[PDB]
Design a protein around this ligand. Structure first.
Ligand SMILES: CCCCCCCCCCCCCCCCC[C@@H](O)O[C@H](CO[C@H](O)CCCCCCCCCCCCCCC)COP(=O)(O)OCC[N+](C)(C)C
Lengths: 175, 69
C-alpha cells in the first residue's frame, strides 16, 4: 500500500497470467477460494471498516524529529568537552542511520532473491551490486573500531586510510 | 507513558553538557594544583611550604662590652 515509499522499496510491475483452463473438470482451487472469500475475507473486511470508522472520529498526529547539523569532531579542539560531546552524539546518530541504510539494501536483496525464483542468480545482479557497494563503504567506515568506538577512533582510521591512499598515488605517479 | 513519567531529550542532553563542563574544569584544576604544589615545594617562593626561620626581633642591637660585637 501507500504506507511506504515505492522508490525506497521497489518491486517489478507484477505480471500474472490469465487462467486458461484446458479441461472440463471443476477447479477445486477456485471453489475453495470463493468459499474462503465469503467466509473469511468479508467478515474481516467489515471488522476493519468498523475499526477505521472509529479511528476516523479520533484523528491525531505525531511528527518526525529533525536534528540540526552540529560541528563534527574534525573542528573540535583537543580538550573542548562540549564540542566533543555534541560531535560524538551526531556521529552516533549518523552511525545508526548508516546501519539502517545497510538494512534497507539487505531487505531489497532478500526480497529480490525470493521474488525471482529459479532466476535469482541473473535477475538480482543490480541488488547484489548495490549491496556490495554499500557493504564496502560501511566496512571502510566502521569495521575494526572495537567495543568502545568513538568519533575520534573513526577519524584516526580515516586519516590512516587517507595516508595510505596518498602514498599509493604518489608512488603510482612515479611509475 | 512519555507524557506522564519522562521528559524530552533536551533536558538530559543539556544536563550532560553541564556535568561534563564541571568535571573537565575539576580535572584541569587538579592537574594545575599538582603542578603548583611541585613548583612551590621545589623553589619555596610561594605561600606554601614556608618553613620557619629565626625571628630577627630577638637580636639585641645594643653595645656589648666590646666594640667588635
Ligand atoms: C489501558 C490499560 C493498559 C495501560 C498500561 C500502562 C502501563 C503502566 C503501568 C505500570 C506502572 C509503571 C511503574 C512505575 C515506575 C515509574 C517511576 C517514576 O519514573 O515515576 C515518577 C513519577 O511518579 C509516579 O507517580 C510513579 C508512581 C507509581 C507507583 C506504583 C504503585 C502501584 C502499586 C499498586 C497498589 C494498589 C493498592 C494496594 C492494595 C493493598 C517520575 O518522577 P518525576 O520526576 O516526577 O517525572 C518526570 C516527568 N514529568 C516531569 C513529566 C512529571
Amino acid at each position: 500500500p501507500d504506507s511506504w515509499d515505492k522508490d525506497v522499496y521497489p518491486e517489478p510491475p507484477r505480471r500474472t497470467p490469465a487462467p486458461a483452463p484446458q479441461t472440463s473438470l471443476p477447479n477445486p482451487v477456485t471453489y475453495l477460494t470463493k468459499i474462503f472469500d465469503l467466509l473469511v475475507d468479508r467478515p474481516v473486511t467489515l471488522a476493519r471498516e468498523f475499526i477505521e470508522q472509529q479511528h476516523a472520529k479520533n484523528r491525531y498526529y505525531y511528527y518526525h524529529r529533525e536534528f540540526r547539523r552540529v560541528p563534527d569532531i574534525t573542528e573540535c579542539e583537543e580538550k573542548d568537552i562540549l564540542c566533543m560531546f555534541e560531535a560524538e552524539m551526531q556521529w552516533r546518530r549518523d552511525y545508526k542511520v548508516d546501519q539502517e541504510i545497510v538494512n534497507i539494501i539487505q531487505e531489497r536483496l532478500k526480497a529480490c532473491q525470493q521474488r525471482e525464483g529459479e532466476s535469482y542468480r541473473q535477475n538480482c545482479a543490480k541488488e547484489l551490486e548495490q549491496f556490495t557497494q554499500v557493504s564496502k563503504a560501511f566496512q571502510d567506515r566502521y569495521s575494526d573500531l572495537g567495543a568502545h568506538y568513538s568519533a575520534r577512533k573513526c577519524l584516526a582510521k580515516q586519516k590512516q586510510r587517507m595516508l595510505a591512499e596518498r602514498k599509493a598515488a604518489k608512488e603510482a605517479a612515479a611509475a | 507513558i512519555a507524557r506522564t513519567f519522562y521528559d524530552g531529550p533536551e533536558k538530559n542532553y543539556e544536563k550532560t553538557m553541564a556535568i561534563l563542563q564541571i568535571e573537565a574544569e575539576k580535572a584541569e584544576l587538579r592537574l594545575k594544583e599538582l603542578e603548583v604544589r611541585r613548583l612551590m615545594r621545589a623553589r619555596g617562593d610561594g605561600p606554601w611550604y614556608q618553613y620557619p626561620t629565626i625571628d630577627k626581633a630577638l637580636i639585641d642591637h645594643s653595645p656589648k662590652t666590646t666594640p667588635d660585637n
